[PDB]
Every structure is written in structure tokens, then in C-alpha cells.
């Protein structure tokens, strides 16, 4: 199933108080009106890729979803983040957990911390080893799909775990449909009111109107013509053309000669009509110093 | 626990200790004469008692004497690309001392491993625990070592007779990250009483300036620490003692 991500998933990108101002910031936000995947909890908890940041949304009435598991293999071979909420305690670990064949909750350890009607929206991202988790709870009266409207996301948790996570799975309480979207490096124009709260945001890479909006850093565009960007056709393939060189150049012999000349009569051999690889020069560890001054060594092939 | 540790980890599994919820002095490290190299360009070591950082990580590892020059931004070498890569915009101060009387044995200390073979340069602050056998030749390597199949980890023979270029050196990289989050690792400077309705040279969590500190009605959310205006100047600050 698929759903349109109307306006949800906009968050405070940093923690500097701003008020009554339109500020542009480029960060990992989910695109407006993009396709988000829809999961059900009737009669379904697969693993999804944690590529660059995930936005999660859940509609809840009886507290079914109680935790999440993030990692790469999820088989006690590596450290995997497990967050669980038992009704009084929130527990976050990255321990060498022994996961079940199908992880659920019924009715080398490095870290441990212990403390429809309700829409709970979250965003999970990993920046420089820091796991940022933002969340917000709101009352809703809607059973079919996710509601239409705007809601700014406030940050809650920042954990310095320093773990590479690429896949994640949720934890459900078994005796509740949810939505998952992906973040992208987009530039958003955020509006701070007089209370300092973000009341609106424009994904200005959505359409020409939003492009004009963020080029003019305003939510209102007057009548007229405005230059917004520059289009340029991108190349589709690379075309390398070099002479049909037929002779590898005797670079080995100037290193493997019987005797070398002295410094007072150093020999100057011109190298011409040659194919120069220099890879055997890089990989060989017999050299004491390898110092290139004009051109970088790796950019010679 | 990080400077006078019993044993240091090798560069293939270098320890990354997060230092938080304490007072960082660095005064005993400046007066210590047993240290060999103490180099850093981003931040000066003398202006740390008044300045405060958000967080700091200690990257400790044992490396050879002649390889201590490779742990620096802009350097190129075997260790700088296969075991410990430092970014070009790295801020922080690195310390290194000799361990010729600790990590040495009669027959040789072979408990320190370093990566020698890798098909790609390491990322900044990347920890490569990959044990897969490197494939040097054109034939595929199915985990069996031999021709064109080498183990990327190698060891040195540490003896008290070896030269200063082959002696083991304990290197600790103190990398400071400064974010807008509330700081926790500040210098050893005592605080004083606060005065209002008069402009004074203030210094809150390393952020210094001059001006009047007046009461505010701006509702700062939990982890708000500093306020920035259109001119990127400080507009409001949160006292670390009183919320």
C-alpha cells in the first residue's frame, strides 16, 4: 500500500531560538507529497532499509507498537539498537541481543539506559555516530488513513552510539496501521512565529512555485516574472580517446639496471612513446620516499 | 583511565572513549615532560580553561615512531589511509608519548596489529574491523590465503635494541565537537556571581562577549543553549547553573 506524505515530517533542524523569521536550511527532510509505504497490523513486521534517515508515523489506540530494533544483521553478531517501552520504563540498549525468529513482545555489551485516537510521529537519523530521534504525540479522530495537516516535529533524544545502522524492524505488542517514509537532502524554508514555533515550511525543490518561494525567501510571491535557477543538460556517458599505444615503456629497467650513475653525472633519460601505469610504483614497498610535488600521485593513470 | 591506561589498543581496533560529565583541565598534560609530540592547529592549547566544548572523544592507539607524522590532516601514508584517517577540517589536539619501556619484550611484542592491504581509502573517523582476506591478484579469493591472497593485518617486532623509528608510541587524539547543544566538558575555571542591568564581559560555556544580561520571556525549549541573530551574533544564552 502507498500513501501521499502531505506535510508531515518537518522538524527543528537545530536548537537556535528564532522568532518571526523565514529561515532557509538544507537538511535531510522527506519530500512533500511523496510516496510513503503503508503497513497494517491486522490478521506484518518486515525489515526496511535505513539508508539515510527514516520518518515513521503511527496511528494508535491501545499501545500496540512498543519498540524498535535497528542494525545490520540482527543475529547477535553485531551491536543493534533496541528501544522498548514497558508501560513504565523506556529501555534503550545496543547490546548483543539474542533476537527471536520473528521479534515480538507478548502480553560484548556496551550501553544500557532505563527510565484512531493518538498519532505518534518520529524521525530517526544518524549523523557522525549520533542517533537523533525526534517525536511528537497528537490527538486524532480518524480511522482510515493519516490525517491532512501541518505539525512541526520537536527533537527528543540524541544518543552517541557511533554504530553503522542500515536496516531496522519494529516491535509490536501481541496478545494499528503505520507509515514509513525516507528522508532526502532537501532545502526547506521554515517560518518562525512570534512564539518561536515553526508554523509552516516550504520544500522549495518541489515545484517552480516553491523554487521561486525560496529564492525570494517569502511565503507570498507577487505577480510578475522571477528567475529561479539555471538548467543544464547533464552528460549521459564518458568518451575516452587515447592513441593506440603499442609498446609498454621500459620503466622497470631504470630501476633494475646493473649499476646507476653517480650524482655528479646523473643520467637523464627521455621517456617518449610510452604507456605509464605507475601502479607497480605505488604498490611496491621497497621505496624509502615517494614525493610528488606537481601532480598528485593517484591521478596519473 | 585514558592517558595512564594499563594497555592500549592497536590501530586496527583503536579505542574511542567518549569523555563527558566532567571538568577537562589539560593542565597536567601541559606540564608533563614525558610526552614527545603535542601538535594542533585548529584550537590553541592555552585557551581551554575559559573555553568550553560540547563533547570530546579520545582516540587512543599504538603506532610506530616514524609513523607519528602520519596522524595529521593532509598527510598521506599507509596508516593514514588504512588504519586511522583524519579529516582535513579536524579540530582537536593530538598527544603522543614513547612506550619503549612498556610495550617491549625480549623476543618481541606481537600483540599490535595494523592494516596493510585495502582497496579503498578509509573515511574520517572510520573503524575498520574487516577481517576478510584482501584480493591482490585477478583470481577470486574464497577466503583461502596463499598466492595473491594476503591477510591485511601485520605485526611488528618490538625489541629494546630497535631504533627510535621502530619503537612503539602511544598516541591519543582528543577531538572536540562544538554543537549548539548544552556543553558538558568545560575548563577548570571557577564561576562568580552574576550582575544585571550593566554591561560586562561575559563568558558562558566558552562563548565570550560584552553586553548587558537582562531577563528574557522567550520560551527556550529543553536543549536550547545559544541564540543567534541575523548578524550571527549572540542574542540570548542559557545559564548552565540556573535554567
Amino acid at each position: 500500500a502507498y500513501t501521499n506524505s502531505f506535510t508531515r515530517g518537518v522538524y527543528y533542524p537545530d536548537k537556535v531560538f528564532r522568532s518571526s523569521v523565514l529561515h532557509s536550511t538544507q537538511d535531510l527532510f522527506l519530500p512533500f507529497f511523496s510516496n510513503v509505504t503503508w503497513f497494517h497490523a491486522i490478521h506484518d513486521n518486515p525489515v526496511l532499509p535505513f539508508n539515510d534517515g527514516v520518518y515513521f508515523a503511527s496511528t494508535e489506540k491501545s499501545n500496540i507498537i512498543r519498540g524498535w530494533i535497528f542494525g545490520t544483521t540482527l543475529d547477535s553478531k553485531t551491536q543493534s539498537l533496541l528501544i522498548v517501552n514497558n508501560a513504565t520504563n523506556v529501555v534503550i540498549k545496543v547490546c548483543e541481543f539474542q533476537f527471536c525468529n520473528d521479534p515480538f513482545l507478548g502480553v560484548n555489551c556496551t550501553f544500557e539506559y532505563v527510565s484512531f485516537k493518538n498519532l505518534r510521529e518520529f524521525v530517526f537519523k544518524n549523523i557522525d555516530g549520533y542517533f537523533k530521534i525526534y517525536s511528537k504525540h497528537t490527538p486524532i479522530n480518524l480511522v482510515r488513513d493519516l490525517p491532512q495537516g501541518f505539525s512541526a516535529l520537536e527533537p527528543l533524544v540524541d544518543l552517541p552510539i557511533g554504530i553503522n545502522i542500515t536496516r531496522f524492524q519494529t516491535l509490536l505488542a501481541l496478545h494499528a496501521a503505520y507509515y514509513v517514509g525516507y528522508l532526502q537532502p532537501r532545502t526547506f524554508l521554515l517560518k518562525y512565529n512570534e512564539n518561536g514555533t515553526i508554523t509552516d515550511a516550504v520544500d522549495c525543490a518541489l515545484d517552480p512555485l516553491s523554487e521561486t518561494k525560496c529564492t525570494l525567501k517569502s511565503f507570498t510571491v507577487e505577480k510578475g516574472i522571477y528567475q529561479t535557477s539555471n538548467f543544464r543538460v547533464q552528460p549521459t556517458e564518458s568518451i575516452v580517446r587515447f592513441p593506440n599505444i603499442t609498446n609498454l615503456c621500459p620503466f622497470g629497467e631504470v630501476f633494475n639496471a646493473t649499476r646507476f650513475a653517480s650524482v655528479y653525472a646523473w643520467n637523464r633519460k627521455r621517456i617518449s612513446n610510452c604507456v605509464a601505469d605507475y601502479s607497480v610504483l605505488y604498490n611496491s614497498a621497497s621505496f624509502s620516499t615517494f614525493k610528488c610535488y606537481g601532480v598528485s600521485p593517484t591521478k596519473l593513470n | 583511565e585514558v592517558f595512564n591506561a594499563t594497555r592500549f589498543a592497536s590501530v586496527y581496533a583503536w579505542n574511542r572513549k567518549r569523555i563527558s560529565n566532567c571538568v577537562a583541565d589539560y593542565s597536567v598534560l601541559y606540564n608533563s615532560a614525558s610526552f614527545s609530540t603535542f601538535k594542533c592547529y585548529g584550537v590553541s592549547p592555552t585557551k581551554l580553561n575559559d573555553l568550553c566544548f560540547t563533547n570530546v572523544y579520545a582516540d587512543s592507539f599504538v603506532i610506530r615512531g616514524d609513523e607519528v607524522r602520519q596522524i595529521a590532516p593532509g598527510q598521506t601514508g599507509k596508516i593514514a589511509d588504512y588504519n586511522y584517517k583524519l579529516p582535513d577540517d579536524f579540530t582537536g589536539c593530538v598527544i603522543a608519548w614513547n612506550s619503549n619501556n612498556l610495550d617491549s619484550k625480549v623476543g618481541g611484542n606481537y600483540n599490535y596489529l595494523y592494516r596493510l592491504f585495502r582497496k579503498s581509502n578509509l573515511k574520517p573517523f572510520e573503524r575498520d574491523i574487516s577481517t576478510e582476506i584482501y584480493q591482490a591478484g585477478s583470481t577470486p579469493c574464497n577466503g583461502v590465503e596463499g598466492f595473491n591472497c594476503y591477510f591485511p593485518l601485520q605485526s611488528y617486532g618490538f625489541q629494546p635494541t630497535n631504533g627510535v623509528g621502530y619503537q612503539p608510541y602511544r598516541v591519543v587524539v582528543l577531538s572536540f565537537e562544538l554543537l549548539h547543544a548544552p556543553a558538558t566538558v568545560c575548563g577548570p575555571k571557577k564561576s562568580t556571581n552574576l550582575v544585571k542591568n550593566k554591561c560586562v564581559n561575559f563568558n558562558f560555556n566558552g562563548l565570550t562577549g560584552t553586553g548587558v544580561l537582562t531577563e528574557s520571556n522567550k520560551k527556550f525549549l529543553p536543549f536550547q543553549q545559544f541564540g543567534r541573530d541575523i548578524a550571527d551574533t549572540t542574542d540570548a544564552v542559557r545559564d548552565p547553573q540556573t535554567l
Epitope: N283, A285 | G107, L116, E145, F147, F151, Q154, S155
Partner: antibody
Framework: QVQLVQSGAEVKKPGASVKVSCKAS????????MHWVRQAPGQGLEWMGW????????NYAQKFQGRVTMTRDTSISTAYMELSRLRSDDTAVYYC??????????????????????WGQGTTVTVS | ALTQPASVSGSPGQSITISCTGT?????????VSWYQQHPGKAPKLMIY???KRPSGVSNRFSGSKSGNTASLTISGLQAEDEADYYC??????????FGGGTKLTVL
């Protein structure tokens, strides 16, 4: 100044096991894969296996796969080779051997090249 | 796995050759053939390695040659001390240091 010493002569019964030590000095111990060769009295040489003192890598001959076991102690720079399920034709002289170059031969076809340093003697005799 | 003559005789001062024939997959595709000398009851000594390269200290009288699928040891100026067994060596595809029938060199 490369010095190599092995254990003494040993006698074993058929079906038992034998453990020989191989203690080296004067060079970087882990920088040389240790090869092993056996020779029956009055016969030719017979290579048996090699061990990597670094990371503990080892590989045996398909002739002896399952009967011979190696370990090594880098703290004292020694190798140890064990022959299990001994029979009559294992009465022979055994050496370890040091490979020629360093394991930095991008080409240095190591450690499959050869043996420059051969050890003194270990004679294992297996008779009822 | 390799074949070499069992015993060949020579005279003092003579230049003598010792053959060792392999296949195209072990000696014919690799320039990695060698020659070892061992005296009776003695430890073997590597005389020729990596085709014709010699370890330090070995006399120049021992040289090597390779032709198609054949290795050849050459000894210039045969002496009485040259009496020993000579083995050819070549990589064969798997573990490991292999040999020949053994060439016992005798002087007349």
C-alpha cells in the same frame, strides 16, 4: 645471526601422538611463515604444512589433512607441531624452516617462495 | 611430481648440467624453479632460487636455465666438494615445496 633450536629426539608407540617445538630468534618472528619438512631415514624430503605466526593462519598438505595440528606462541617466538595417529612410516627426521623474504612483497610471492634457514634436527621414531 | 635423472657423473673442471622436466601448468607457466643441494646426513642448502637468483654466499659456479617445460642446473668448474644430492623445485598448484627423483652428483 638468525638462530634456530628444536626439541630433542622422541620415541612413540603406534597410534599415539608426538609434539615438537621450534624456537627461533634473531629476526621478526611473525614476519615469516614457518614451513615444515620431514624426511625418512635414507629417503627424500616431504613437506607437511605451514603456519602463519600472525593471526594464526595455517594450512597443511592434503597428504596429512586431519592428522597434523599446529599452534604457535608469539610471546616466546615458538612454533609447535603435533602428529596424531602415528604409524610405522612416520619414523623420520623433521625440521621447520624459515621462508626467504618479508610479507611486504606486493609481488613477493610470499609465503610460497622457499626456505633459506633450515633447522637442526628433530627425530621421531615410532616402533612397537 | 617432477622428473630428474637419478645420478650423473662428471669430471673436474667440467661444466655439468642437470635436467628437471615438468608440465606447462607448473614449470611452463611460472618462472619459479629452483635447485637445492644436500650432502649425506646433512641439512639441505638452497643454492639456486627464483630461476637463477642466488642467496648471498653461494658460489657463482652454480647457475640456472629454463626452457619450455625444463629446468636446468649448470655447474662450471666441477670440484670434489660438489659431490651431493641435488633436487629441483617448482610450484605445482597446491601445497607445496616439491622435488624430483634426486640427482646424486659424483666426480671421477
Amino acid at each position: 645471526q638468525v638462530q634456530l633450536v628444536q626439541s630433542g629426539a622422541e620415541v612413540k608407540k603406534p597410534g599415539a601422538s608426538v609434539k615438537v617445538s621450534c624456537k627461533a630468534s634473531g629476526y621478526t618472528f611473525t614476519g615469516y611463515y614457518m614451513h615444515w619438512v620431514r624426511q625418512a631415514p635414507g629417503q627424500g624430503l616431504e613437506w607437511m604444512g605451514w603456519i602463519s605466526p600472525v593471526s594464526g593462519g595455517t594450512n597443511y598438505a592434503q597428504k596429512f589433512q586431519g592428522r597434523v595440528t599446529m599452534t604457535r606462541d608469539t610471546s616466546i617466538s615458538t612454533a609447535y607441531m603435533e602428529l596424531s595417529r602415528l604409524r610405522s612410516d612416520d619414523t623420520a627426521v623433521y625440521y621447520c624452516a624459515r621462508a626467504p623474504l618479508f610479507p611486504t612483497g606486493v609481488l613477493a610471492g610470499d609465503y610460497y617462495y622457499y626456505g633459506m634457514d633450515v633447522w637442526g634436527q628433530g627425530t621421531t621414531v615410532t616402533v612397537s | 611430481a617432477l622428473t630428474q635423472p637419478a645420478s650423473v657423473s662428471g669430471s673436474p673442471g667440467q661444466s655439468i648440467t642437470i635436467s628437471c622436466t615438468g608440465t606447462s601448468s607448473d614449470v611452463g607457466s611460472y618462472n619459479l624453479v629452483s635447485w637445492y643441494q644436500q650432502h649425506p646426513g646433512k641439512a639441505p642448502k638452497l643454492m639456486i632460487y627464483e630461476g637463477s637468483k642466488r642467496p648471498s654466499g653461494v658460489s657463482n659456479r652454480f647457475s640456472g636455465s629454463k626452457s619450455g617445460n625444463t629446468a636446468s642446473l649448470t655447474i662450471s668448474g666441477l670440484q670434489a666438494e660438489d659431490e651431493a644430492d641435488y633436487y629441483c623445485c617448482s610450484y605445482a598448484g597446491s601445497s607445496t615445496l616439491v622435488f624430483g627423483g634426486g640427482t646424486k652428483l659424483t666426480v671421477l
